[PDB]
Design a protein around this motif. Structure first.
Motif: not given
Ligand SMILES: *[C@@H]1O[C@H](CO)[C@@H](O)[C@H](O)[C@H]1NC(C)=O
Ligand SMILES: *[C@@H]1O[C@H](CO)[C@@H](O)[C@H](O)[C@H]1NC(C)=O
Ligand SMILES: *[C@@H]1O[C@H](CO)[C@@H](O)[C@H](O)[C@H]1NC(C)=O
Lengths: 374, 365
Positions: A259-275
């Protein structure tokens, strides 16, 4: 043994978070720093594919194979599954996947996703459902559908079964429910894609009067991405299934980093729960890493064109396939082991109940103990 | 437009007579385009040899594939046809789900079975079934039992490997006072059950066996019939049809070396459907020629794709009169506007008791 092991990644539409998890899991492997745990570097080449286009699928596949990948991590759906699994089988290339496990008994496919059939039947037996609705689509195969129907006629259940995968007009979901009322139906087993469970549950709400005294059993490991809050507030019983235990220390340590990861390199890490499929993607990298550390340990010498009819040496890829299928590792989805057809074996499915009384983990299911309530 | 139309032939275990019917129907048609074919034999026990079979046929460059699947090879074979746009023409059981690029010569049986359970007013019965022809019938029985509140006692028997075990199931059903049986099994397995019914004795008079299988003429039901039992069967070949008689007349005159199973066994309805598949194919390609669509090779993993859409559409568009009656297909390749003849055999005698179609349902004589 080579310094670098390359693998393919075949991604489709709506696997964005899984793609990030794939990228993050591979990174985690590469950093470190432990000679024994990281005796080689893991590289990959990624293609995106349009399953609705067969050439798009065989093209993506050949691209990977012709780069000489040691394995392909990837997704399929109902349109591409046969092409993709049949060609991996003919070319002896191991395909590791979080997608629905194949109905057929096939080689060269490692299926990260465990079967739901066993857990559903045990739960139907536990709840003593002998009259119920079964709404289904065919996106995850026909295995649950056929087991249900056979159980129903053999056990003298009264199952009203309705296919709903081809429905586009949401009104139709309403009419079907009204039709189910004419049979005094209170119990629903819903074997559909998450997106379609959401649409059905929205119609139950818009319709009204279909919550209290109703019970919805949601046959989909994607339980956490299901929007059921409004149904629950109305009195409904809901049963669901999960294979990710948020109390698991390994799940926790992954989530905190993730959840610390950047949204540009890792989309969907901060704006959605882990599928759960993102967890299965992570665990696939553990399986691959372990397989290949094993082959390295045995000083195995790891050894064409993307063509079916011309041959393929019998023992080709067999070493890798076996190494993948013999792994026993603990991941985010618990104990991970495979049978000879690449199917999860010795796995655990956690069962969740939501009721007006509250919401809880109601037990677990495994092949040996079946359903154990708690 | 090519003079010569090439098709593939995918034959399995226990399709010998169909293979001879195939070769002969093609010969009859040839003796104005000419029909060529190439055969590959297939073992379905592997999802591997299946992929291999289809891929070989595909690489020869065929315009359509006539052949067979079983429950094991069905999904993989039909999926390949749909993905590579190669039309598959088959007498095998019609697929449970809607598929593209599969022309199913064999009409659904469930409508007729239901129409007749109603005609007889069966409300309590035994349902014996195997899954070798799909789940379509089983599903329709499940639904109809709910809709009409039937008391169906159902047993799966496909996996039974010792014939003695059939006597045991029949006894259990006797404790439930069961006199009415719906048998939804392969012909071979139906013969085994009826033999056990006879061996058991006392299970003929008073009983009624409804045999859900279009291979009616291959069921050995003479001993059972002499005991007083009622039997109901279904067929799609009318032996009094001039076209059937004309085919048969020339067919029993073929030398047994080249055409096995023509002289030592009656024509299976699947061999009639095989003949009908050539009718459908020849007619589809007359359409394409009329439309001035030109149909004039690579590997599975490599234009003949672009033409596939038209071939599939021509096939599904045809209307022809064959050994199995009126032949038409819907958008999913399923027989439509077909007729099923219903036969009942009683102590009073054997006779065509009527016919069934989708519109009139069951019409007794
Ligand atoms: C919902 O759960 C309650 C609580 O156990 C149960 O008693 C009731 O029968 C369930 N409702 C339905 C429709 O099954
Ligand atoms: C199943 O997994 C458990 C827990 O990981 C492990 O200890 C055991 O070895 C496995 N059991 C079998 C029967 O393989
Ligand atoms: C068999 O045939 C007669 C009709 O002629 C029918 O009335 C009888 O009920 C049938 N037998 C059984 C066992 O259902």
């Amino acid at each position: 043994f080579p310094n670098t092991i390359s693998i393919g990644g075949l991604f489709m539409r709506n696997t964005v978070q899984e793609h990030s998890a794939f990228r993050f899991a591979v990174q985690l492997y590469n950093t470190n720093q432990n000679t024994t745990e990281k005796p080689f570097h893991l590289n990959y080449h990624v293609d995106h594919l349009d399953s609705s286009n067969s050439f798009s699928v065989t093209n993506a596949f050949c691209s990977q194979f012709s780069r000489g990948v040691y394995a392909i991590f990837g997704f399929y759906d109902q349109m591409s599954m046969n092409t993709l699994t049949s060609f991996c089988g003919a070319l002896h290339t191991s395909f590791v996947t979080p997608s629905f496990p194949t109905d057929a008994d096939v080689q060269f496919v490692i299926q990260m996703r465990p079967a739901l059939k066993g857990a559903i039947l045990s739960l139907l037996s536990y709840y003593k459902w002998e009259k119920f609705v079964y709404l289904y689509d065919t996106e995850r195969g026909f295995s649950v559908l056929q087991a249900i129907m056979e159980a129903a006629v053999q056990n003298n259940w009264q199952v009203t079964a309705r296919s709903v995968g081809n429905i586009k007009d949401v009104q139709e979901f309403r009419r079907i429910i009204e039709e189910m009322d004419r049979r005094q139906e209170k119990r629903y087993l819903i074997d559909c894609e998450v997106e379609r469970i959401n649409t059905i549950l929205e119609q139950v709400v818009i319709l009204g009067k279909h919550s209290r005294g109703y019970h919805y059993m949601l046959a989909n490991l994607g339980f956490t991405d299901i929007l059921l809050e409004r149904v629950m507030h109305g009195g409904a019983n809901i049963t669901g299934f999960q294979i990710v235990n948020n109390e698991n220390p390994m799940v926790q340590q992954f989530i905190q980093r993730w959840v610390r990861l950047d949204e540009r390199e890792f989309p969907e890490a901060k704006n959605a729960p882990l599928k759960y499929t993102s967890a299965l993607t992570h665990d696939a990298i553990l399986v691959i890493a372990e397989a290949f550390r094993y082959l390295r340990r045995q000083r195995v010498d790891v050894s064409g064109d993307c063509l079916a009819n011309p041959a393929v040496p019998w023992s080709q890829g067999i070493d890798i396939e076996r190494a993948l299928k013999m792994v026993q590792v603990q991941g985010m989805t618990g104990n991970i082991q495979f049978d000879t057809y690449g199917r999860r074996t010795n796995y655990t499915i956690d069962v969740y109940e939501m009721k007006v009384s509250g919401s809880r983990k109601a037990g677990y299911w495994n092949e040996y103990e079946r359903f154990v309530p708690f």
